[PDB]
Amino acid sequence: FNYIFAVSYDGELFKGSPPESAQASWLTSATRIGTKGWANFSHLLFNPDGTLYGVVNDKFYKGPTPHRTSAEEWIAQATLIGDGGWGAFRFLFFDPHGVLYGVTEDKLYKREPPSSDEDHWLGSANLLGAEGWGDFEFLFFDPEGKLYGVVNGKLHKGDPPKDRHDAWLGSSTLFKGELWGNFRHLFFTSNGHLCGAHDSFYKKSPPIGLDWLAHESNMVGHGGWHMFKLLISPLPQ
């Protein structure tokens, strides 16, 4: 079993099985686990250990997945792990190992996540890429820890760079297609299905291959997805 988590523009948070049926209403099959205020975060992301991390008002938090909770109740109970600078991250996202990656000021960094706001995260983070990361439209991992990035509407994959001298984009593998920036959401499920959504949701089960995602044959939710601000799914540990 794995799940998609969706924040709507009404500030509700839903949990449900990934969509498979183009005519089905995915919301009908889903459970509301967050009641209100969930669209107020700048960032919301899963740790593969199953903890939810979130950035709201430039502060970073971690806590258990909510169980019919407002965003306010959740934040009040969460551990504060950062204060100042976090809202500016273009991307913040975990690898399958629970190592935090982040893009800020055009650069890519990784490090164990903070556990307190005294821990200046950038101060000891590993610089992976000195330039060009601020132009990506998406940047995310699969369950195997391959990195995926969209730039100039094209989707690239490759082992993540290990230091600033790895020319990642230069050595990466190119998907077919030049409309990958037209998705609002593009991510992997826990079980390695590639998901892309705008108003409609497209999903490719493994093997993913290198074909264009948004083919009529991969459509699993025809219409109605414009209601979600965020769709995420945890990677396994």
Side-chain angles (χ1 to χ4, degrees), residues 1-67 69-72 74-215 217-237:
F1 312 135
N2 63 186
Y3 302 94
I4 285 324
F5 293 79
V7 171
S8 72
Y9 284 107
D10 306 305
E12 294 170 315
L13 176 62
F14 300 92
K15 174 191 176 182
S17 290
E20 295 284 354
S21 296
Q23 278 77 43
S25 161
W26 175 87
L27 269 195
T28 299
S29 77
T31 184
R32 190 183 68 174
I33 59 167
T35 52
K36 53 172 173 186
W38 293 92
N40 296 353
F41 289 83
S42 54
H43 299 74
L44 207 60
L45 56 143
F46 274 106
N47 187 300
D49 70 11
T51 308
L52 176 63
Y53 281 62
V55 174
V56 61
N57 296 336
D58 215 28
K59 295 172 200 215
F60 201 10
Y61 297 90
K62 73 174 178 175
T65 307
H67 294 86
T69 305
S70 65
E72 167 187 284
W74 186 92
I75 296 158
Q77 303 199 22
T79 306
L80 180 59
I81 65 186
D83 182 3
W86 292 99
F89 276 72
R90 192 174 170 93
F91 296 104
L92 257 188
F93 63 102
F94 285 104
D95 76 6
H97 308 292
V99 179
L100 183 60
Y101 279 66
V103 168
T104 180
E105 300 214 296
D106 203 46
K107 296 187 274 278
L108 179 64
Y109 287 93
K110 76 179 172 183
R111 210 209 71 174
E112 279 291 309
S115 295
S116 114
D117 55 320
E118 297 183 349
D119 177 355
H120 174 218
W121 186 82
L122 277 170
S124 51
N126 306 111
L127 174 74
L128 302 182
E131 53 170 342
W133 300 89
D135 188 359
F136 281 69
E137 303 156 86
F138 295 102
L139 191 68
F140 56 99
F141 275 108
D142 68 17
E144 277 77 38
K146 202 131 300 217
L147 185 62
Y148 289 74
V150 176
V151 236
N152 300 134
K154 293 171 196 84
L155 173 67
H156 289 78
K157 56 158 193 188
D159 304 327
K162 283 303 164 228
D163 63 44
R164 78 133 69 208
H165 305 111
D166 273 349
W168 188 76
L169 196 62
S171 329
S172 72
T173 303
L174 199 59
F175 280 66
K176 297 173 171 185
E178 55 187 33
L179 297 185
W180 292 94
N182 284 13
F183 296 118
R184 293 172 25 57
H185 307 103
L186 184 70
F187 65 95
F188 280 96
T189 59
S190 316
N191 297 339
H193 292 36
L194 175 64
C195 295
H198 42 61
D199 314 320
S200 292
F201 196 124
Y202 297 85
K203 183 168 77 52
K204 176 76 182 81
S205 54
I208 305 302
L210 299 178
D211 292 336
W212 177 230
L213 176 61
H215 281 297
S217 65
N218 296 327
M219 192 156 63
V220 294
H222 182 27
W225 290 86
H226 56 91
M227 80 175 287
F228 303 109
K229 182 185 171 188
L230 189 63
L231 304 173
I232 55 178
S233 193
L235 293 182
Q237 191 73 75

